[PDB]
User: Fold Dihydrodipicolinate synthase from Rhodopseudomonas palustris.
Amino acid sequence: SLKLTPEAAGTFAIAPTPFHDDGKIDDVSIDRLTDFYAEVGCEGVTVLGILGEAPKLDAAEAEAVATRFIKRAKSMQVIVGVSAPGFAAMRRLARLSMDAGAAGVMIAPPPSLRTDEQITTYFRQATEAIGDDVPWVLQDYPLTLSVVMTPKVIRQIVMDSASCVMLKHEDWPGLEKITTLRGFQKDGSLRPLSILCGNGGLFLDFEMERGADGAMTGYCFPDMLVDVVKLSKAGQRDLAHNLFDAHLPLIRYEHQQGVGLSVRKYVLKKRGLLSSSAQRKPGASLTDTAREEVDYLLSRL
Amino acid sequence: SLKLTPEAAGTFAIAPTPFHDDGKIDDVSIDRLTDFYAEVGCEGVTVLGILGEAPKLDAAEAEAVATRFIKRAKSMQVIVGVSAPGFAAMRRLARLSMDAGAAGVMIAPPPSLRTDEQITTYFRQATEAIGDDVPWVLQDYPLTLSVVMTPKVIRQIVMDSASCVMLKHEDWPGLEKITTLRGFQKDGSLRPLSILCGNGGLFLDFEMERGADGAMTGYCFPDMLVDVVKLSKAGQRDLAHNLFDAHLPLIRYEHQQGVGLSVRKYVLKKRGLLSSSAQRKPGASLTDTAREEVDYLLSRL
Amino acid sequence: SLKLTPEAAGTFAIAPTPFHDDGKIDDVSIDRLTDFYAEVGCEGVTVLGILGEAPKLDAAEAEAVATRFIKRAKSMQVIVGVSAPGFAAMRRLARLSMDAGAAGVMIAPPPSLRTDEQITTYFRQATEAIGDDVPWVLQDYPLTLSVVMTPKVIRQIVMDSASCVMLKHEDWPGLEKITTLRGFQKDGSLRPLSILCGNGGLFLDFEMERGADGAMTGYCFPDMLVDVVKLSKAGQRDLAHNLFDAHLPLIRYEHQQGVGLSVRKYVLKKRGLLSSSAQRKPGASLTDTAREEVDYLLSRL
Amino acid sequence: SLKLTPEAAGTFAIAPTPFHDDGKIDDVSIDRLTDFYAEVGCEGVTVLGILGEAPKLDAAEAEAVATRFIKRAKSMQVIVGVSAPGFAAMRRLARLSMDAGAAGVMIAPPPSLRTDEQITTYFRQATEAIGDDVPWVLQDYPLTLSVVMTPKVIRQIVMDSASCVMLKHEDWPGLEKITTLRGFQKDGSLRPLSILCGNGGLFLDFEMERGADGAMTGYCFPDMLVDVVKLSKAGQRDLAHNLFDAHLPLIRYEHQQGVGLSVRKYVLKKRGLLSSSAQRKPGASLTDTAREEVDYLLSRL
Assistant:
């Protein structure tokens, strides 16, 4: 029932939507995944959106999935991705999620926005749609969304809003962006803002050093990134980097467009969290060889 | 209750979704628009999709709008745009529309498809989703959708399908594509296929000469394009081009991204078909000057 | 020998690079084209760049072509397109052109620029490259270059520069941009700036009304647009629009990507200005049917 | 003087173009880099192109740089990137490079190609331009070039050509592509073809297992990838992966757009190979913090 705040930190797991082979939602696995995240020290869970294959679900299914996760994660803050082609759908899912118990929602910009004018305007319209009372997360992921946001544009989006409390940092290269944003806070031009990093965790080791508050990861070993985040906050540089480096081979293997979801679901099933590694169409599973390669990386971990 | 066939021809009007200023759907205008299209000789109506601001409606609203149009156009074939981010939503709207009385549905490819392999695969998955029994229209509009489809790719998509009965031709330049496709039919590699042209009607005059069956137009004077199509089919080249040329100034003014919808709704309201020219956010109305310019073009018509 | 100024106005013809069938530069036609432009009242000529198939010429050829035009147009201001992948090549061609007698150069942004920060920075680097003493033209053509520049960004680019004297306006929709820019000049935030319009002349009729100074056109009848510009400046609205409307059918036919150059060269040859309508690879000529269609439009003119 | 063949294998170093702070080419460093590559076991060197900042050099400079490298690498095969906006420039640089002693040239497709028809056509025009006698390398790097080529399209490009002897594999995900291509060779539909991998070496460990012949790397430790390639060919899986994993942290840090070149030049200077880490505009050097981070990774190696 707690609203997301700018002080959010630690590790937020990005949850895939569990499916059986026929494509039906696997609720048992949703609960199992949720219990797992809590058990290993995750502070929150992000649901739906692209990684949760939300585009492959119908309106009613998306609401049910988001609700299942929200009700199960009683001790964690759940963030629901509400990015949509239009504001009506966004408002519906956002309000529903909040009434259900969500901590807040995540909003990514449409892929067509180019000028900084179009970017800031979109988000003002977006917040007007979901309501200024809804805590939200700004997703900055140029690699897949095309849109590029400068630190100054991000600062404007946040300060123009009543409730943007977090930035899901996925810019690549994006290390300097973190430093710049923290600098704005130091000079007083930017208010409190949580910065959780993504982009498959490819730069989590240095992102923590730059000043990120934690990670919002879809990595199949969120339990181990919990330690990377902890070690980093503890100033144990060598220990943090040693653990990160041990996971980097698998982190980068999973960090492949399309194949990434197949890798995640394959491992989560192998870990006993998912009953099936199935995805809904469009989506292809790992080849026998890719599975062996993933197994090899797992064996070295 | 008639299913769309490859013999579909004439003029199909692309209907905007009528809204009042508060953004609520204006059902009275939906009926008024529908009666208008029938009265002026239109053979069909295409609803929802981008031009109908479908992305700005929620699931329930889209279904209601599509249904309102289907039930009103008793003597015309109604095509419902079902393009969507995922197959579940597409299947829902497609089946609902068909059960309601739609003649068929329209499917555009996602903006990311590049290889011809990805294009043909997508549509096979798309038809599997809506059902091979549903007549559908392939939308080819590179200008706004980015995807480019060669005549051979189009031929494959059609022949791979059980029910693709029409191509909404919007390629630009696309005159040679029509000729090439008609050639495939002549040599026997392509079965019957209706070709209705779009892209704001910018090349309708020559598209008819190339062999198109008609137009699927969002132009504010569908009643006049009905005559352009008729004159063209009658071999009255000079008369057809004289009428087209008289409309070209306004056709091109309306053929502007973003401003186009504002121009259409402004004129349809002025013609007494819409109660309000309102659009839902995001969307901006015409400036006082743009309105005057449109008025000037109208006065010269 | 006159440098381009913010007071530049009238009609500037965009010259194609004349080639014979073997692909060799046709110098006789370059002189013939130049004499033609001067004879019909053109105030200037723009050479090289995409429309002049500059990407299909080697460094030495580009310099020779630009020079041939500069030396021939003794009574007109010649603008050389210097857009390039790098600043070294840009500086070379710019300085060479100026030493030869060019009035100034044109610079378009690379297709990757998205943030307004990247846009303004690029042009500051661009001017540093060619020299702050070189008068230049800012090309704004989103349709083909992808980059989008807001009026405020344009204002910054101009005011940040010592010598940006003109904007080649090709935004689409772009009528409001002209009005906004003229407004900045009225309020004093923007200094004198020439605005010549492009985008195939698709909106020249209204662009003149908005306050453009003239046209920079590649249209095969620059002689007739000279009159459209004159009539527009004379406040003869009906006469201006009547003449424009008579040309719109051909203007729009030529306004097709790829086919456009083929249409231009075909007509310029038919008008006796080019010995051959040949282009260098990659490039395809008009089909027999397209030629007939162009002939039909010409006959109605 | 040896021409590149389909049997090319091992490690090919992608050479940056050494510059001093004033931006002038540093020939002493070109020789030093070349001697280094030979000394550590590299089989070849690739010059110019994007990584060599070729777009920042003028025609004469590019030819001089390519020539300097060709003449110095007497015992290695040198590949010159000839990708260009037009065929004239491509032919000039290709023939010049071959006359100088190059083993072959590399050709990447323009960023606009989408249909497989456009892709295969481009390369047929490209080979016609440089001459069918010139051995060349097909660059497949969607991440930066946008163009996507299916294995079948690649097969067609190769079989349509008289001299395409190598594929610079940079697809991501691209492991299955290697397997598919090797399969075509097994079934006889694809002739001998060298496959050297790129994309910063992010997947070199598994690419070798899939059947790649080696690497074409811009990584600052080409000497160590020489061993990774050797260990991989020797079937020493654990040793190969242990060494790769030790370098992965730095490999991924350098694998950042824009920052990548700064990282490479910074390290190559620190290794005593470059006098200066300077790049030509546009290009920014590493911040003090980024330098420290790179130093940290280096210290752990």
In short: The interface with chain D takes residues 172-173, 175-176, 179, 202-203, 205-206, 209-210, 237, 241, 244-245, 248-249, 252-253, 256-259, 287, 289-290, 293, 296, 300 of chain A (CB under 8 Å).
